[PDB]
Design a protein around this nucleic acid. Structure first.
Length: 74
DNA sequence: GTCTCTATTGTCCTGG
DNA sequence: CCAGGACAATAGAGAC
């Protein structure tokens, strides 16, 4: 079972694809640095619809898998 | 040609 | 309790 996407991941999910099109040149690491930078520049109001999407997902996740404990490793 | 790393934020879990 | 990890998506770039 894979963890549900947080706000960033949801926004990033598309934006990276976006950034990769406008910049096929740039490596992915760099894409990650840029997404990071412009997330922080995104206002909370701006981020809202994404938080809201990340929640629909978290809820939906809850339905699909009731017995899910997040289990990391070491 | 086939693995591993990369770098980000947010959210959860777990060793002192 | 709390500071430091895990792992969510992602696909091309280096290593061998």
């Amino acid at each position: 079972i894979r963890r549900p996407m947080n706000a960033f991941m949801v926004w990033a999910k598309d934006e990276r694809k976006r950034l990769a099109q406008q910049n096929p040149d740039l490596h992915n690491a760099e894409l990650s640095k840029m997404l990071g930078k412009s997330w922080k520049a995104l206002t909370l109001a701006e981020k809202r619809p994404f938080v809201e999407e990340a929640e629909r997902l978290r809820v939906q996740h809850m339905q699909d898998h009731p017995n899910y404990k997040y289990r990391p490793r070491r």
